[PDB]
Task: structure prediction
Amino acid sequence: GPEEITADIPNVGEAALSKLDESGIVYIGAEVTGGDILVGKVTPKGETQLTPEEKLLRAIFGEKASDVKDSSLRVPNGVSGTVIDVQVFTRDGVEKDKRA
Amino acid sequence: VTEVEIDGVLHEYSTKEGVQEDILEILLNLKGLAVRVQGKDEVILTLNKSGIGPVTAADITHDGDVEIVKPQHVICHLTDENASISMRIKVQRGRGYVPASTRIHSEEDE
Amino acid sequence: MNKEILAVVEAVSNEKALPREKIFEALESALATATKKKYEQEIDVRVQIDRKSGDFDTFRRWLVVDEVTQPTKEITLEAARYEDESLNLGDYVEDQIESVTFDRITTQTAKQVIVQKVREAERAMVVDQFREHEGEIITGVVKKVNRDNISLDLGNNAEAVILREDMLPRENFRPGDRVRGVLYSVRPEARGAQLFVTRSKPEMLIELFRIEV
Amino acid sequence: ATILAEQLEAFVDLFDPILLRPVDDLELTVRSANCLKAEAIHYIGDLVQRTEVELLKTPNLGKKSLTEIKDVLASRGLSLGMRLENWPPASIADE
Amino acid sequence: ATILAEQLEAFVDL
Result:
């Protein structure tokens, strides 16, 4: 499955997922430190597994975005500072988010 | 001065229309500013001004214990015939040198 | 009433003989608790699931109390007098509802809540297996050997525990070796109860001789 | 130290105030301003001094009475049963 | 001077 750029990634608190926009990009001008999430990205992990809980949840919500490996971009270790500019480039035939 | 609250900007490394200068020299000039306060301990100052001309601390709207010791220090210049600028200046008492690295200690959703 | 919950209750491998409506209500209540922990208002939730149709609904609660804590689920007698004093202090009467959320964050939260609910159901099954006998001449295989205690695994995911003080003075149990003893107590532990045995009394010998001869 | 104490000796020199304000001048919205004024409490102090019996049970409140209590009153706005002095709380004397 | 004096005051001790 194609990589997707949602704001929604588990295993991390809303403290990390606070400055993210509707899509998952930090707002301009955020004082950030090392390890802070910059852009939330997920990669379809593939189910390849049946449990009485996973398919149970999938039947409950109908959303297959669960059980998906995360590949978000975060601030490198040690470096800190603020964000000044963000550029967006997308392939043709593909829609764009609100921020783009 | 502790911090500044420029309204028409988003961060420290931007510009502003109608302003002859950038933001960093504004920060340096406010660093050069000095004001004595006696009664209140952490009073907050501000300014609003338009028109082409120099900007000095004398133009700051004063208050009770606010004391502009040098009401001639230039802050910036305005190049637009309608060049309204907005800022809120907070002053605080303290001792020694406090670098901005230690200032990140707040963490109270500032 | 999307009727998908009907098929969910009619999965039906593990919840056919068990109450399907109760299982669906518990899962939906876990999901609604996750949604309440996803909103900012600390309001209690109540999932009502139907058995004949299968589908369910989620309502928000008011939790009539005598205090102001949990303000989204806080009421009082003076506050209940707005409803002509119909509500009393201590009640959990629901007076609100919610509709729907995709909520991939609450999807992970509901994954955690469903895992917790499945663990609770397994604990309930283990406690039911322990209570289905409450104590008898039974055998078990010690899975773990802790300090002065042996935790033993049994069939149908059931477990039990044998204390050193409850064991014989000379006969010491070891992991991997089956031990048969007469159980006399079922202490309710974390995640269900476990059977406790004492293979040192004449009752165990009488029970062994009855089945052997 | 005594010497340094001496020769340098003389130079040493040895319940909410918003309740008393108008109810419409608070965090309550337009639909809640009429609810605060349903019990004739134009100021939230009378609303604070009164309970929900005379406000939500009146015909000037809709079905959101169980929700407005969890919306505005839950945020410590008014109608919490506070015993005001006249407008403000008795222990809120700020003269 | 007061600062220096109160630093001195700790020396009138053990």
